[PDB]
From a paper:
In Gram-negative bacteria, conjugation is mediated by a large transport apparatus—the conjugative type IV secretion system (T4SS)—produced by the donor cell and embedded in both its outer and inner membranes. The T4SS also elaborates a long extracellular filament—the conjugative pilus—that is essential for DNA transfer. Here we present a single-particle cryo-EM structure of a T4SS complex from the R388 plasmid that comprises all four sub-complexes: OMCC, stalk, arches and IMC. Three ATPases, VirB4 (also known as TrwK), VirB11 (also known as TrwD) and VirD4, power the system.
We first solved the structure of VirB4 in its unbound form (VirB4unbound) and fitted and rebuilt the structure within the IMC density. NSEM provides a view of a double-barrelled IMC made of two side-by-side trimers of dimers (the barrels) of the AAA+ VirB4 ATPase, whereas cryo-ET shows a central hexamer of dimers of the same protein. Of note, a minority of the 2D classes in our cryo-EM data set displayed the typical side-views of the double-barrelled architecture observed in the NSEM structure, indicating the presence of a small number of double-barrelled particles.
Numbering used by the authors:
A (entry chain E): 826 to 870, 876 to 985
B (entry chain D): 496 to 529, 534 to 568, 584 to 870, 876 to 990
Amino acid sequence: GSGSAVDMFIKIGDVKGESKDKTHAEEIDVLAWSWGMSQSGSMHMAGKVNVQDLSFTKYIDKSTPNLMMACSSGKHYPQAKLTIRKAGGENQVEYLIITLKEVLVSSVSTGGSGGEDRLTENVTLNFAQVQVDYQPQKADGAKDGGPVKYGWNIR
Amino acid sequence: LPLKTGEPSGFNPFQLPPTHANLIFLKQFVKKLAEVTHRDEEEIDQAITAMMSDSIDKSLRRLSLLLQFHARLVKWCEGGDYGWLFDNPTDALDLSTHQIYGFDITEFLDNPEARTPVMMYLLYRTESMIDGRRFMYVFDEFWKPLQDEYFEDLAKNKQKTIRKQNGIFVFATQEPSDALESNIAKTLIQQCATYIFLANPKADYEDYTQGFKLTDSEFELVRGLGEFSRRFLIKQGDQSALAEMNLGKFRTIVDGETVERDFDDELLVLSGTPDNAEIAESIIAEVGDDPAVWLPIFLDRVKAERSDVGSGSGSAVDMFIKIGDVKGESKDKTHAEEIDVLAWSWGMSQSGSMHMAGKVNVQDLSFTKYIDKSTPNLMMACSSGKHYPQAKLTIRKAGGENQVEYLIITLKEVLVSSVSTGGSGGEDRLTENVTLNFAQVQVDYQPQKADGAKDGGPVKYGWNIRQNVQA
């Protein structure tokens, strides 16, 4: 077989990676994802939520000073798109698709002081509207589909 | 005694035995210049003996003046030949503890000046000093230092003297055009007892049956031997056969074990050039004369490095600097030996949104180095707020140590504002930090691929940070 590895690729505008995998042909590839949702208006003391900005750790893309010019200029990319499949096979069911709109870069990491010898870069972003498509991520290869969604706004 | 800098890569003469300094300086001068008035050169030898009779071995100016009243001119030059016969001691007899040495003939390619008088005097020294043990004198490309019948008369008289005194001569030279072109080599072949056809290289043939008197089958074998198996053919007396050194032989302890091919201590014989350079540099900086008291651990280090990699030198990291007076400890082409830095970690952030011309994020930029050498210049630039004219730093991942750097970043008008220093009982190597601002970033991020490909051209972020959004 091919092993046991998750399958995650993303495009955000003309930002692209140096990845060489089977489904990651110079795609952006990530090592960590970090965003959760929160709604402080709950009775335990419409869309009134606490602010939640998105974040991740990615492998090194070929367009990083373009991202820094986007940060210092306020330039957003109009769309970010993700596909994440569970481990067990690279060409399995696309267990998750994510679509992000008005994708402005919030932060970059990893270059400067001596804290990270070879570590991947955290990048944080903001948004206007995000929607996902979840296929059932059972610990399997070929598994039943049917996307369950949410699409949600910055409001 | 290999080719090196202008240290003693040769051996000199005593130059003042007043019964034989005349003949020593006469032969040394004629083999140094090879062209005189041919009148009262013994008076020149006696006058330079009386002039060097102050204590010993005076300046080249005094030597050339006493010799005159092109050899004087080239001794005044001394280009790469500090081991000549004048103003020096005999480094060969400073090896009287272990009289085992040899010469890189790269300087002794230049007859008559560097080649002839040092070699003729040292052959005189080793031949006249009959220590009673065996003697061995080995040659390769004999004809370039030896262009005079002086060596033929030497081989007739003093070589036959030391032939009863355990002396042997090992002429392992090149292709036989060299030997057939010198009648001195013909006289030597008339006294050379055995002949080793070590290889069949690119070499001139079919006069090789002349003088040596090979048969057709013998000449067929010495041409069909080859040079890569490193086996040979041997003729002595009037007879010959194919032979070898058993380079495939190995320690057959029980039933035929691991084929070590006797490769341990063969690196002395093989002499691989970067490992020879490492062992030679560590020995030469270690001790002047070279007994094998530090050599076994150097052989174990050479075996470990050769089993690791052949001249790899890591090729994994590159993080180096030059900020005013400091510089890098760089294995890359940029700097050398001074200061390494730790790693690559900083960024910038933005909290705002335009999607329901950036935001002002008051930030500093920082960097961590190791223990410094140029402490007070950085101290002055830190306290006074002095902007260095540049701060250049080199970043490159694995994929080669001499490749183009993955990010070359020069910050501009680097005022210095804080440096963390430290120290402890456990501070084997203190790291320190500069956290600072400046006028301009000049980031040059090259999107170099993993295989050494640099598609495409590097992306620059060369913008003012001081009071301006950076494009």
